[PDB]
Amino acid sequence: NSPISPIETVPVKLKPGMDGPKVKQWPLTEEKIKALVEICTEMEKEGKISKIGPENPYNTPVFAIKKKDSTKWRKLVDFRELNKRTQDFWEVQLGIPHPAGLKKKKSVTVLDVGDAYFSVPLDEDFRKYTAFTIPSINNETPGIRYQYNVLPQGWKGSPAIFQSSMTKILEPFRKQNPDIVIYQYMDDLYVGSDLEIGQHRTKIEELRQHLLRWGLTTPDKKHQKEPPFLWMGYELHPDKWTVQPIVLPEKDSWTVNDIQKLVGKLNWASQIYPGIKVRQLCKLLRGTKALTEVIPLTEEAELELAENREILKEPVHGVYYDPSKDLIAEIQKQGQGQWTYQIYQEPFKNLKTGKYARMRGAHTNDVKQLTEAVQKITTESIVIWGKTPKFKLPIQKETWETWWTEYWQATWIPEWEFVNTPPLVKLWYQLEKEPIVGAETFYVDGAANRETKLGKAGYVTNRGRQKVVTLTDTTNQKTELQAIYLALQDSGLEVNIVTDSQYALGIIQAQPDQSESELVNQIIEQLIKKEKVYLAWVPAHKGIGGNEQVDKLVSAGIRK
Amino acid sequence: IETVPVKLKPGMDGPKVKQWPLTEEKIKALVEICTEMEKEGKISKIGPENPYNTPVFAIKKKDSTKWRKLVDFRELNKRTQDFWEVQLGIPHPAGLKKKKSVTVLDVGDAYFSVPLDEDFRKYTAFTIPSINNETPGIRYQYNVLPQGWKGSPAIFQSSMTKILEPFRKQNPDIVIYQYMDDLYVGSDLEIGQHRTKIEELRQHLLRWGLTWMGYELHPDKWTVQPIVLPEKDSWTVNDIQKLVGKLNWASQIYPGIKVRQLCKLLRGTKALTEVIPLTEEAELELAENREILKEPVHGVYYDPSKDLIAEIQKQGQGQWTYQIYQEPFKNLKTGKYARTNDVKQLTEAVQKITTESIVIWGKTPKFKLPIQKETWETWWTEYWQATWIPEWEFVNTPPLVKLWYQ
Numbered sequence: 009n010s011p012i013s014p015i016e017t018v019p020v021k022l023k024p025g026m027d028g029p030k031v032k033q034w035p036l037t038e039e040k041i042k043a044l045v046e047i048c049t050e051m052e053k054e055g056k057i058s059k060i061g062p063e064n065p066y067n068t069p070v071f072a073i074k075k076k077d078s079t080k081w082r083k084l085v086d087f088r089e090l091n092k093r094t095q096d097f098w099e100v101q102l103g104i105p106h107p108a109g110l111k112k113k114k115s116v117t118v119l120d121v122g123d124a125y126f127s128v129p130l131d132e133d134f135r136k137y138t139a140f141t142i143p144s145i146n147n148e149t150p151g152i153r154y155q156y157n158v159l160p161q162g163w164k165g166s167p168a169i170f171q172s173s174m175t176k177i178l179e180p181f182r183k184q185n186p187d188i189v190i191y192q193y194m195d196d197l198y199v200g201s202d203l204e205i206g207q208h209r210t211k212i213e214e215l216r217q218h219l220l221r222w223g224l225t226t227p228d229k230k231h232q233k234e235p236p237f238l239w240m241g242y243e244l245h246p247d248k249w250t251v252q253p254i255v256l257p258e259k260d261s262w263t264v265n266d267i268q269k270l271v272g273k274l275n276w277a278s279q280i281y282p283g284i285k286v287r288q289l290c291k292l293l294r295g296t297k298a299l300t301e302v303i304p305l306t307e308e309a310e311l312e313l314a315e316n317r318e319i320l321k322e323p324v325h326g327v328y329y330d331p332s333k334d335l336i337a338e339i340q341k342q343g344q345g346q347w348t349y350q351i352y353q354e355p356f357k358n359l360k361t362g363k364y365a366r367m368r369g370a371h372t373n374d375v376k377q378l379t380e381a382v383q384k385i386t387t388e389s390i391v392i393w394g395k396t397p398k399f400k401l402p403i404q405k406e407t408w409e410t411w412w413t414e415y416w417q418a419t420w421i422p423e424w425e426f427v428n429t430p431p432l433v434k435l436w437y438q439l440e441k442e443p444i445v446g447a448e449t450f451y452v453d454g455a456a457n458r459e460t461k462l463g464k465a466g467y468v469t470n471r472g473r474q475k476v477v478t479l480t481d482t483t484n485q486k487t488e489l490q491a492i493y494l495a496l497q498d499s500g501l502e503v504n505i506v507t508d509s510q511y512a513l514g515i516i517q518a519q520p521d522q523s524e525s526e527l528v529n530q531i532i533e534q535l536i537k538k539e540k541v542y543l544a545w546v547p548a549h550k551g552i553g554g555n556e557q558v559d560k561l562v563s564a565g566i567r568k
Numbered sequence: 569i570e571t572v573p574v575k576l577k578p579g580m581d582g583p584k585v586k587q588w589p590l591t592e593e594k595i596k597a598l599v600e601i602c603t604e605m606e607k608e609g610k611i612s613k614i615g616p617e618n619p620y621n622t623p624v625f626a627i628k629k630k631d632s633t634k635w636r637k638l639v640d641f642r643e644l645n646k647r648t649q650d651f652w653e654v655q656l657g658i659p660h661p662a663g664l665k666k667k668k669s670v671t672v673l674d675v676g677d678a679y680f681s682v683p684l685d686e687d688f689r690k691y692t693a694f695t696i697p698s699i700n701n702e703t704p705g706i707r708y709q710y711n712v713l714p715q716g717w718k719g720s721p722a723i724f725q726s727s728m729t730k731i732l733e734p735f736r737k738q739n740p741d742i743v744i745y746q747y748m749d750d751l752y753v754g755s756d757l758e759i760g761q762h763r764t765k766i767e768e769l770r771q772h773l774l775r776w777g778l779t780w781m782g783y784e785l786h787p788d789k790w791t792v793q794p795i796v797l798p799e800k801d802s803w804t805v806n807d808i809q810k811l812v813g814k815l816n817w818a819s820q821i822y823p824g825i826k827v828r829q830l831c832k833l834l835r836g837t838k839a840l841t842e843v844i845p846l847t848e849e850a851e852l853e854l855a856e857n858r859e860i861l862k863e864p865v866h867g868v869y870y871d872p873s874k875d876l877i878a879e880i881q882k883q884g885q886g887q888w889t890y891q892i893y894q895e896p897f898k899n900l901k902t903g904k905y906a907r908t909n910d911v912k913q914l915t916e917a918v919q920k921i922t923t924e925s926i927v928i929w930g931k932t933p934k935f936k937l938p939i940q941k942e943t944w945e946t947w948w949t950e951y952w953q954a955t956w957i958p959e960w961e962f963v964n965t966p967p968l969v970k971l972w973y974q
């Protein structure tokens with residue numbers, strides 16, 4: 009049948025301290041035992057396997073299967089035990105190539121290697137462990153036994169050793185053809201050059217022949233696939249690329265399974281269709297689940313899905329990369345902590361788009377989110393193109409400088425420019441750096457009991473006001489945020505607040521504009537309405553005047 | 569030379585650490601470097617049957633334009649600690665921190681002459697990646713002692729002693745310490761003389777085939793950062809509160825700090841702006857605290873069986889404060905670094921602090937770094953110039969700890 013490469017074999021070992029597999033073969037039907045003899049004979053002739061006697065003590069089970077409306081039999085070997093015992097190998101491919109990172113080429117050819125694994129030898133010292141046995145009719149006589157001389161299907165080392173082999177075989181060609189691009193992916197090779205079609209169709213052949221001289225067979229000009237190439241969920245045309253067509257189902261009733269698959273089809277679409285959202289659709293899945301159970305769509309979810317259909321209405325495409333030009337990345341806020349971005353080299357011809365719509369922690373603001381989004385896009389660009397883009401961001405240079413210079417975490421956006429595409433990222437309040445003369449100084453505190461969970465939150469002020477609200481099923485943290493919230497409602501537009509909660513202070517000093525906490529979100533509304541808030545901290549239980557008095561009020565029937 | 573066998577710990581296996589994405593600039597720089605190293609037999613390509621990996625980066629050597637290869641052997645260093653710390657440990661001299669000037673010489677080239685035990689070589693595997701996963705990306709392992717591996721100078725220790733025997737005999741008041749790829753040379757000499765002795769040392773080294781801080785370090789010009797307390801003509805309720813808070817947290821470190829009188833001044837429910845004249849008792853209580861803060865901490869000592877931690881705080885205006893300790897609030901050292909961008913500055917502080925840490929204890933500390941993991945991990949290599957890498961983790965450590973130190 010087909011060649012096996014003369015390439016040097018990769019030494020292979022079992023995991024230290026483990027002997028090979030010795031799994032018992034289970035008896036099979038005559039039908040199967042016949043199918044298997046027919047197959048293994050045919051394989052032996054071709055060099056893939058060899059007969060070996062009962063000297064070899066190892067065994068892996070074997071099986072034959074034939075589909076319902078069919079007549080070809082297939083052999084299945086169950087390498088689970090040998091795989092447990094085979095060494096770990098180096099991970100095949102760190103990632104998979106993005107279309108947007110491909111450089112356009114005048115002519116491009118796809119070459120699948122035929123029967124890749126069977127075209128490569130296996131380390132002789134290791135073959136013995138690949139032993140299997142076709143058994144006799146009702147297991148009377150000892151079975152016929154074999155071992156592989158090539159890479160077996162489903163064995164742990166085949167993918168890696170194959171790639172390794174193809175790499176070594178390609179090295180020379182590459183050195184003597186530096187202007188030719190050869191992508192390696194699984195059995196495939198994608199070959200692109202800027203040469204004129206005549207010289208391209210020549211060079212392809214030298215490759216096919218170079219490959220054949222190492223036992224690797226490939227399809228000839230007649231059998232070679234044509235543009236556009238369908239590949240890994242993409243369409244690859246001669247000067248553009250897109251995702252393969254997206255069919256958004258129309259349903260009376262939506263199941264978890266229907267929504268799960270929809271989110272995915274959209275998430276996949278988001279890499280070239282700008283503006284795709286999935287927040288409201290994802291919210292639905294945040295529950296006990298049950299694939300076949302119907303979830304009725306909410307209004308927000310229907311508005312979101314409808315908007316997505318509109319975007320997907322007419323097809324959209326992305327250009328290929330051009331390493332002479334720079335990369336420009338633009339980001340826009342879609343609201344709800346959803347961010348959308350586009351990357352182009354010439355405006356507005358996108359290489360790709362994407363979305364960031366994440367929640368790092370519990371309390372956050374847009375300035376922080378935009379930084380994260382920038383950070384994410386920057387890693388993405390280093391992976392795809394090998395350089396970082398120039399950014400264009402909806403934030404005043406002024407707003408940015410104020411934030412970073414005063415914030416406590418180190419932070420750093422690389423070269424960027426402001427672009428006035430509303431909504432703009434701003435900070436919605438700032439806290440005073442100095443106490444406010446002629447403003448009521450509230451001293452606030454909260455206390456919760458750990459057994460009962462019954463809390464109290466309140467204040468005492470220098471104008472002699474006081475309040476104490478009682479809370480049920482609460483915690484120390486929540487009472488201390490209630491305490492600040494009371495002080496904000498009851499005070500007027502200017503106010504100083506003293507607290508003994510580093511927890512509250514820390515949250516509130518980071519200038520959040522959104523939270524998972526409802527109480528924080530209320531405290532936020534208030535801080536915006538105010539004109540001046542100063543917020544200081546004193547240590548608790550030190551008899552600091554003001555603090556001590558609200559401490560007595562909130563401790564009443566809660567703690568000693 | 570006959571190769572020294574290196575036994576990895578029982579139980580532990582070699583590093584399996586993913587490579588952080590590199591830019592084209594650095595990938596091309598690495599492909600050039602690794603090509604030469606292959607020709608010179610220092611590294612050899614490896615097959616897929618080597619499952620191990622350690623990350624690699626490219627930097628520019630301190631104030632230079634050529635690229636240098638920097639392997640991150642942090643995992644491999646943890647997993648081979650018995651070899652380099654116990655079995656062949658290089659002892660740290662306490663003299664070094666006392667000397668007037670200390671000079672740091674790179675001596676990493678020394679190691680490329682000594683072959684590495686063939687059974688260990690697989691644990692030094694690393695990868696040059698490719699852009700957009702075009703190619704599977706090039707895989708090497710080391711044949712000679714690699715730079716960055718704490719085992720290397722441990723092995724080379726006996727060769728380094730021969731190299732330096734004449735110089736030491738001729739200069740018995742000069743202290744020389746090897747830490748990883750660098751030599752630390754300390755003298756009390758006049759700086760002109762010091763530099764003459766360094767050039768002399770360069771020449772000894774040259775005969776064995778070996779070509780955030782200033783030129784030299786000045787350890788004896790390192791002293792503490794007292795936690796300082798403001799001095800004012802007029803004090804407010806707020807100022808006192810801030811002072812009591814500051815004093816309060818200080819008292820966990822310094823025993824004897826007292827605020828009883830100070831608190832008495834705030835009795836009531838007073839407006840923050842209202843001024844409050846100090847009583848004789850309190851002013852004396854403050855003065856007493858102020859005395860305690862200028863002086864060193866009693867009871868706090870370096871324990872060689874414990875890791876060193878370093879915390880750093882961003883003070884604004886290009887200012888960064890930092891503390892080194894082993895048990896929280898038992899500070900072994902405190903300091904300040906000054907004057908670009910947040911990341912560039914922060915990496916400068918880390919290297920500076922690490923260096924002092926090598927000088928004082930022969931150990932780098934684990935940093936608690938106030939920054940987003942990803943931001944740090946993208947950028948740090950842009951301004952890094954050291955041959956080593958300390959351990960770091962990331963924290964969101966506000967708020968007044970910032971104000972408590974500057």
Ligand SMILES: N#Cc1cc(Cl)cc(Oc2c(Cl)ccc(CNC(=O)c3[nH]c(CO)nc3Cl)c2F)c1
Nearest residue numbers: 110112113114115116198199200237239244245246
């Ligand atoms: N199947 C498949 C497949 C998958 C990948 Cl990741 C790449 C691939 O080949 C390409 C290579 Cl090697 C380089 C660039 C592109 C982008 N497309 C072209 O340049 C291109 N040119 C032409 C005719 O000039 N058709 C196509 Cl498609 C390529 F498409 C083919």
